[PDB]
Design a protein around this motif. Structure first.
Motif, PDB file in Angstrom:
ATOM      1  N   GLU A  15       0.847  -1.307  -0.103  1.00 43.18           N
ATOM      2  CA  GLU A  15       0.004  -0.121  -0.137  1.00 43.18           C
ATOM      3  C   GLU A  15       0.882   1.272  -0.070  1.00 43.18           C
ATOM      4  OE1 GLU A  15      -0.769  -2.649   2.038  1.00 43.18           O
ATOM      5  OE2 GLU A  15      -2.526  -3.453   0.876  1.00 43.18           O
ATOM      6  N   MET A  37       4.575  -9.105   2.632  1.00 40.91           N
ATOM      7  CA  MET A  37       3.097  -9.523   2.459  1.00 40.91           C
ATOM      8  C   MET A  37       2.327  -9.451   3.733  1.00 40.91           C
ATOM      9  SD  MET A  37       1.351 -12.611   0.667  1.00 40.91           S
ATOM     10  CE  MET A  37       0.289 -12.515  -0.704  1.00 40.91           C
ATOM     11  N   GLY A  54     -19.206 -15.500   2.801  1.00 36.99           N
ATOM     12  CA  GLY A  54     -18.539 -15.559   1.317  1.00 36.99           C
ATOM     13  C   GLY A  54     -17.607 -14.346   1.107  1.00 36.99           C
ATOM     14  N   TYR A  55     -17.503 -13.484   1.904  1.00 35.04           N
ATOM     15  CA  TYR A  55     -16.214 -12.506   2.068  1.00 35.04           C
ATOM     16  C   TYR A  55     -15.267 -13.114   2.371  1.00 35.04           C
ATOM     17  CZ  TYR A  55     -19.046  -8.167   1.450  1.00 35.04           C
ATOM     18  OH  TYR A  55     -20.034  -7.200   1.106  1.00 35.04           O
ATOM     19  N   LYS A  56     -14.113 -12.982   1.738  1.00 30.58           N
ATOM     20  CA  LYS A  56     -12.819 -13.818   1.862  1.00 30.58           C
ATOM     21  C   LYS A  56     -11.859 -13.126   2.965  1.00 30.58           C
ATOM     22  CE  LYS A  56     -12.997 -16.458  -2.316  1.00 30.58           C
ATOM     23  NZ  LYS A  56     -12.508 -16.857  -3.608  1.00 30.58           N
ATOM     24  N   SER A  84     -14.515 -10.690  -3.389  1.00 28.95           N
ATOM     25  CA  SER A  84     -15.473 -11.414  -2.641  1.00 28.95           C
ATOM     26  C   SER A  84     -16.257 -10.519  -2.131  1.00 28.95           C
ATOM     27  CB  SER A  84     -14.662 -12.378  -1.716  1.00 28.95           C
ATOM     28  OG  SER A  84     -14.043 -11.522  -0.845  1.00 28.95           O
ATOM     29  N   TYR A  85     -15.724  -9.250  -2.029  1.00 32.94           N
ATOM     30  CA  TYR A  85     -16.706  -8.109  -1.178  1.00 32.94           C
ATOM     31  C   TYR A  85     -17.634  -7.473  -1.876  1.00 32.94           C
ATOM     32  CZ  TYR A  85     -12.322  -8.660   1.611  1.00 32.94           C
ATOM     33  OH  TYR A  85     -11.043  -9.017   2.486  1.00 32.94           O
ATOM     34  N   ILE A  86     -18.799  -8.176  -2.098  1.00 33.93           N
ATOM     35  CA  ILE A  86     -19.860  -8.218  -3.161  1.00 33.93           C
ATOM     36  C   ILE A  86     -20.827  -7.074  -3.016  1.00 33.93           C
ATOM     37  CG2 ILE A  86     -19.463 -10.324  -4.213  1.00 33.93           C
ATOM     38  CD1 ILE A  86     -22.668 -10.480  -2.492  1.00 33.93           C
ATOM     39  N   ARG A 116      -7.564 -13.697   4.730  1.00 30.47           N
ATOM     40  CA  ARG A 116      -6.374 -14.293   4.753  1.00 30.47           C
ATOM     41  C   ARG A 116      -5.767 -14.546   5.646  1.00 30.47           C
ATOM     42  NH1 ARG A 116      -2.399 -10.637   1.298  1.00 30.47           N
ATOM     43  NH2 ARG A 116      -3.684 -11.272  -0.469  1.00 30.47           N
ATOM     44  N   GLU A 162      -8.609 -11.064  -5.393  1.00 32.16           N
ATOM     45  CA  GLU A 162      -9.381 -12.208  -5.082  1.00 32.16           C
ATOM     46  C   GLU A 162     -10.246 -11.909  -3.515  1.00 32.16           C
ATOM     47  OE1 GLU A 162      -7.703 -15.860  -3.690  1.00 32.16           O
ATOM     48  OE2 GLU A 162      -9.560 -17.101  -3.368  1.00 32.16           O
ATOM     49  N   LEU A 163      -9.672 -11.181  -2.811  1.00 30.23           N
ATOM     50  CA  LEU A 163     -10.298 -10.636  -1.614  1.00 30.23           C
ATOM     51  C   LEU A 163     -11.434  -9.519  -1.955  1.00 30.23           C
ATOM     52  CD1 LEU A 163      -7.627 -10.260   1.281  1.00 30.23           C
ATOM     53  CD2 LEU A 163      -8.971 -12.387   0.529  1.00 30.23           C
ATOM     54  N   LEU A 164     -10.881  -8.431  -2.778  1.00 26.51           N
ATOM     55  CA  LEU A 164     -11.866  -7.387  -3.143  1.00 26.51           C
ATOM     56  C   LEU A 164     -13.101  -7.983  -3.951  1.00 26.51           C
ATOM     57  CD1 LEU A 164     -12.569  -4.630  -3.439  1.00 26.51           C
ATOM     58  CD2 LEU A 164     -10.753  -4.390  -5.493  1.00 26.51           C
ATOM     59  N   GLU A 189       4.606 -13.561  -0.408  1.00 21.95           N
ATOM     60  CA  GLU A 189       5.697 -12.537  -0.928  1.00 21.95           C
ATOM     61  C   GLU A 189       6.194 -11.935   0.049  1.00 21.95           C
ATOM     62  OE1 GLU A 189       3.495 -10.208  -4.018  1.00 21.95           O
ATOM     63  OE2 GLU A 189       1.801 -11.741  -3.604  1.00 21.95           O
ATOM     64  N   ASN A 207      -6.347 -17.713   1.289  1.00 18.98           N
ATOM     65  CA  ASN A 207      -7.289 -16.939   1.032  1.00 18.98           C
ATOM     66  C   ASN A 207      -8.666 -17.683   1.351  1.00 18.98           C
ATOM     67  OD1 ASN A 207      -5.752 -14.429   0.816  1.00 18.98           O
ATOM     68  ND2 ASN A 207      -5.997 -14.680  -1.446  1.00 18.98           N
ATOM     69  N   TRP A 256      -5.652  -3.075   5.967  1.00 21.10           N
ATOM     70  CA  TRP A 256      -5.828  -4.451   6.530  1.00 21.10           C
ATOM     71  C   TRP A 256      -6.313  -4.225   7.869  1.00 21.10           C
ATOM     72  CZ3 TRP A 256      -5.408  -8.586   3.302  1.00 21.10           C
ATOM     73  CH2 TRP A 256      -4.898  -8.429   1.981  1.00 21.10           C
ATOM     74  N   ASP A 285      -0.440  -6.975  -3.965  1.00 21.98           N
ATOM     75  CA  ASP A 285       0.171  -8.436  -3.765  1.00 21.98           C
ATOM     76  C   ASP A 285      -0.458  -9.332  -4.846  1.00 21.98           C
ATOM     77  OD1 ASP A 285      -2.024  -9.847  -2.571  1.00 21.98           O
ATOM     78  OD2 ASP A 285      -1.240  -8.729  -0.627  1.00 21.98           O
ATOM     79  N   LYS A 286      -0.137 -10.526  -5.046  1.00 25.08           N
ATOM     80  CA  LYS A 286      -0.726 -11.472  -6.290  1.00 25.08           C
ATOM     81  C   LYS A 286      -2.053 -11.804  -5.812  1.00 25.08           C
ATOM     82  CE  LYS A 286       4.051 -13.124  -7.287  1.00 25.08           C
ATOM     83  NZ  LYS A 286       4.169 -12.862  -8.729  1.00 25.08           N
ATOM     84  N   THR A 287      -2.768 -11.804  -4.860  1.00 24.01           N
ATOM     85  CA  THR A 287      -3.884 -12.501  -4.533  1.00 24.01           C
ATOM     86  C   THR A 287      -5.003 -11.520  -3.727  1.00 24.01           C
ATOM     87  OG1 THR A 287      -3.274 -13.582  -2.188  1.00 24.01           O
ATOM     88  CG2 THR A 287      -3.039 -14.666  -4.487  1.00 24.01           C
ATOM     89  N   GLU A 288      -4.607 -10.216  -3.428  1.00 18.75           N
ATOM     90  CA  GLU A 288      -5.504  -9.281  -2.670  1.00 18.75           C
ATOM     91  C   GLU A 288      -6.666  -8.949  -3.453  1.00 18.75           C
ATOM     92  OE1 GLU A 288      -2.548  -5.869  -2.342  1.00 18.75           O
ATOM     93  OE2 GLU A 288      -4.330  -4.951  -2.382  1.00 18.75           O
ATOM     94  N   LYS A 308      -8.808  -6.834   3.738  1.00 16.53           N
ATOM     95  CA  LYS A 308      -8.445  -5.622   3.275  1.00 16.53           C
ATOM     96  C   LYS A 308      -9.687  -4.795   3.168  1.00 16.53           C
ATOM     97  CE  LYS A 308      -5.751  -2.970  -0.211  1.00 16.53           C
ATOM     98  NZ  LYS A 308      -4.221  -2.901  -0.877  1.00 16.53           N
TER      99      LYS A 308
END
Ligand SMILES: COc1cc(C(=O)N2CCOC(C)(C)C2)cc2nc(NCc3cccc(Cl)c3)oc12
Ligand SMILES: *[C@@H]1O[C@H](CO)[C@@H](O)[C@H](O)[C@H]1NC(C)=O
Lengths: 27, 11, 250
Positions: free
Chosen positions: A10, C11, C133-135, A25-27, C137, A21-23, C8, C157, C212, A16-19, C205
């Motif tokens: 930030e 990370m 459903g919200y992921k 999911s926040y629907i 980490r 994926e989190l975003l 990473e 995740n 975070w 990062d490579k998978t953040e 996040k």
């Protein structure tokens, strides 16, 4: 005041490579 | 030991 | 962590390793929440059924780590414990209700590229993000499989699961101070914490402020990554009054 903001991510506006994926999911 | 030794100052 | 991937660099800069002395081993995960305070699971420190009862001098805090076993000269910082504080209503007898503890460090840790605190949620954060459903980490140096060990910090995740589904997956009484996470059998995808990961963070996040927040603490599972089982996490927001009380007093 700076909690949760990573120096290597930030703080530099790098993601990062998978953040996304989190975003997505926040629907 | 699987773990590498830690500098003696921490022990 | 089962079915995760290598972290990473930088990370998870709040990641803390709890490291036992004599004998030198991984005790648990934990997280950095300020320059003097570390958050973990109470059962990492006190669990009579397994003859676990660690005092301050038994343990070190290792922050800024990536490699599990190496001494990460000029990167990691190693801290001594001043005092452990375990939730007074931590239920070790039964279901690990309120599985939470704080540790105050003897000296403040200097923040760096590799060492940085995570935020704790307020009511609004919890209400917005702690939804089925919200992921989030989960990170740790725990076992790669239920029944080996990683070279570097692992990350996975996992989606938060509906409370009824959590309850229906187990015979254990699930309280409002817990939530569960992980994929269902029909979801195809896999992943879980495992032995050695307890005490580590479940983070999310915020899409509102792009910070975070530690929403959960890795608590327990019935095995690791089993079909139809989930991981159970301490609900950090529900226990924040206690967190605040301890930090304000001490
Ligand atoms: C004392 O600490 C534990 C007890 C047990 C257990 O055998 N039981 C059966 C009896 O009831 C309980 C509630 C006490 C749980 C399992 C544990 N697993 C972990 N951590 C690894 C882990 C693995 C998978 C997902 C997560 Cl979130 C975490 O710590 C555990
Ligand atoms: C754990 O150790 C402390 C400090 O020695 C002791 O006072 C406490 O009663 C022990 N608790 C157990 C075994 O539950």
């Amino acid at each position: 005041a700076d909690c949760g903001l990573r120096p290597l991510f930030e703080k530099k506006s790098l993601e990062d490579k998978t953040e996304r994926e989190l975003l997505e999911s926040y629907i | 030991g699987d773990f590498e030794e830690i500098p003696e100052e921490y022990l | 962590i089962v079915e995760g991937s290598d972290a990473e660099i930088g990370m998870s800069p709040w990641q803390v390793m709890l490291f036992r002395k004599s004998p030198q081993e991984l005790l648990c995960g934990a997280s950095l929440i300020s320059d003097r305070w570390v958050l973990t699971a109470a059962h990492c420190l006190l669990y009579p059924p397994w003859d676990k009862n660690f005092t301050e001098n038994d343990l070190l805090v290792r922050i800024g780590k990536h490699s599990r076993t190496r001494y990460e000269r000029n990167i990691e910082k190693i801290s001594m414990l001043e005092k452990i504080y375990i939730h007074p209503r931590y239920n070790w007898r039964e279901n690990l209700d309120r599985d939470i503890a704080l540790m105050k460090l003897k000296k403040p840790v200097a923040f760096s590229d590799y060492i940085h605190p995570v935020c704790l949620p307020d009511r609004e954060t919890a209400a917005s993000l702690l939804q089925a459903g919200y992921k989030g980490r989960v990170t740790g140096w725990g076992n790669l499989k239920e029944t080996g060990q990683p070279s570097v910090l692992q990350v996975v995740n996992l989606p938060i699961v509906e409370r009824p589904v959590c309850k229906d997956s187990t015979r254990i009484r699930i309280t409002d101070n817990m939530f569960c996470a992980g994929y269902k059998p029909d979801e195809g995808k896999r992943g879980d914490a495992c032995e050695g990961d307890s005490g580590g963070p479940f983070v999310m996040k915020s899409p509102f402020n792009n910070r975070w927040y530690q929403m959960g603490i890795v608590s327990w599972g019935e095995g690791c990554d089993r079909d139809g089982k989930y991981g159970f996490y301490t609900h950090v927001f529900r226990l924040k009054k206690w967190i605040q009380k301890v930090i304000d007093q001490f």
